[PDB]
Structure 1
Amino acid sequence: HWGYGKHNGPEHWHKDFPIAKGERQSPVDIDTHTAKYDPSLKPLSVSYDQATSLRILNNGHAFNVEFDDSQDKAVLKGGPLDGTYRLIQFHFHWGSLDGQGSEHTVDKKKYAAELHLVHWNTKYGDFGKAVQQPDGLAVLGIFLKVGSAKPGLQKVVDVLDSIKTKGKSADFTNFDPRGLLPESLDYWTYPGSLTTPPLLECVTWIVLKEPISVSSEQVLKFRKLNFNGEGEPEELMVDNWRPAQPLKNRQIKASFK
């Protein structure tokens, strides 16, 4: 199957998922000088106070912290969005070195990692139906740079040993995702896609301008995870990021002047 290796990595995905060469693929490079401020963009509304996390799972490509999305608990609205989007899970993409790891880039700059808070449009009823729609998902992207530790990330770092290999999961209740947000909600937004197969073109991307800082020790722990399952040759889970894709006929809008 697909992955991030030399023989099954991003350059190969188009053979099983032709949409990989589509008109609105993600990630993209955000050219800060070309992005245009859009004064009509409403401020983002991130309501995570009633968030209910459930479990953390190593799925062989990244680890996902899953939330109960059977009710309007944790929701994203406003900004470029029409309607209410419910948080279903968050995950990260990271590198084998601090100089790479993010999927979106800013003026070609690569960050050490990137957090994706995934939300689906409640007008579509469930996640599976939402990914089949052009405005089905809203993903909040947050860059991570290596520096000071992020306290709100430590509980995730400490449970990683329990989900080292593909297919392993662990209880992960009472985790507050608000601890992963930067101070400012200034953002860039554009229409795009899932960045892993099936690469569906169903995402309104909202990428925050302000990165969060995490420590070298925190990201080092991410790099101890495994892509393989237990009892299989160890392949470290590093560089699970897709590189920037052609912008094509799209404009990236900024919420700030």
Structure 2
Amino acid sequence: HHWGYGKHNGPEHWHKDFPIAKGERQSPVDIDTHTAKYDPSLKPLSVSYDQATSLRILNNGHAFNVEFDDSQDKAVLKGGPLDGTYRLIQFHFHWGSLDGQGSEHTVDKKKYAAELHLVHWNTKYGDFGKAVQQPDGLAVLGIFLKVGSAKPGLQKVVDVLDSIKTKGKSADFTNFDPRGLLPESLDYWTYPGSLTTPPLLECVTWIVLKEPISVSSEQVLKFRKLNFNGEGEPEELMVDNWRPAQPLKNRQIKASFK
């Protein structure tokens, strides 16, 4: 029926409605650190989020999105392997039912407890909708989360989850600064890939940070309290909303570091 992460509508079934699921540039992938090529020509990433305007947080039924005003060049990403300016539209997370799983990308087969995705679209295309139809239309910054120390900058997010418990619920979420979620180092891996939920379009240049951020057990615990279902429907906890690693096929993972 409609796609999800259950046994009957999970990742293994998506190909029936979205044939691109078996495409040549599907995400996520496992990052083999010994095979990634250091590429000296990659520039350092440029993250300018000081003018970021968050507006709302929403439970869309598969995750929670924090949305930003993208009507102007307020929060942009550039540099790295990118040509042009990419505007931040939203961020969200993929997480697990246990601390030993939850990330989409893996490193040398290691899975993290969660993965943060900062989604940006190429301003040359004029809007998000047009950007997803192009090979270089989006840039997603991926950050791994490991369980250890609490992340102060994530707490505001954790605290509003009770108010968007079920699908379709939203809440005003202004004045949130996404700089509080960045690790210290911007070293990264990059490869051409796709969206990880239907429609699975192959329009993403992925930028995955080598350094994870730490969150506390209690913090990740609150994520696991969300529901996939709408209000008044039987309760289904929003857990394991991650797609497993896909074949690399004809692609090279480039590293910005050695």
TM-score normalised according to structure 1 size: 1.00
Stretches (4+) displaced over 3 A: none
| Counterparts of 1:46 and 1:187, CA distance in 2 | 13
**Offset from partner CA, 1:119-168 (integer Å, 9 cap, x none):** 00000000000000000000000000000000000000000000000000
| Counterparts of 1:141 and 1:62, CA distance in 2 | 15
| Counterparts of 2:170 and 2:8, CA distance in 1 | 27
Q: CA deviation at 1:89?
A: 0.1
**Offset from partner CA, 1:22-49 (integer Å, 9 cap, x none):** 0000000000000010000000000000
Q: SS where residue 11 of structure 1 aligns?
A: helix
Whether 1:144 and 2:148 are equivalent positions in the alignment is no
After TM superposition, the structure 1 = structure 2 runs for residues 50-129 of structure 1, keeping only pairs within 5 Å, are 50-129=51-130
**Offset from partner CA, 1:169-216 (integer Å, 9 cap, x none):** 000000000000000000000000000000000000000000000000
Q: CA RMSD in A?
A: 0.2
| Counterparts of 2:167 and 2:98, CA distance in 1 | 22
| Counterparts of 1:47 and 1:244, CA distance in 2 | 30
| Counterparts of 1:177 and 1:142, CA distance in 2 | 12
Please, which runs of 5 or more residues in structure 1 have no aligned partner? none
| Counterparts of 2:148 and 2:230, CA distance in 1 | 31
Please, which runs of 5 or more residues in structure 2 have no aligned partner? none
| Counterparts of 2:150 and 2:49, CA distance in 1 | 22
Q: CA deviation at 1:10?
A: 0.3
| Counterparts of 2:58 and 2:28, CA distance in 1 | 23
| Counterparts of 2:189 and 2:234, CA distance in 1 | 40
TM-score normalised according to structure 2 size: 0.99
Q: Report what 1:244 is aligned to.
A: 245
| Counterparts of 1:239 and 1:222, CA distance in 2 | 11
Q: CA deviation at 1:11?
A: 0.2
| Counterparts of 1:155 and 1:38, CA distance in 2 | 38
| Counterparts of 1:47 and 1:9, CA distance in 2 | 36
| Counterparts of 2:11 and 2:190, CA distance in 1 | 23
Q: CA deviation at 1:19?
A: 0.1
| Counterparts of 1:128 and 1:246, CA distance in 2 | 27
Q: SS where residue 155 of structure 1 aligns?
A: helix
Q: How many pairs does the alignment contain?
A: 257
Q: Report what 2:14 is aligned to.
A: 13
Q: What is the aligned-residue identity percentage?
A: 100
Q: CA deviation at 1:84?
A: 0.1
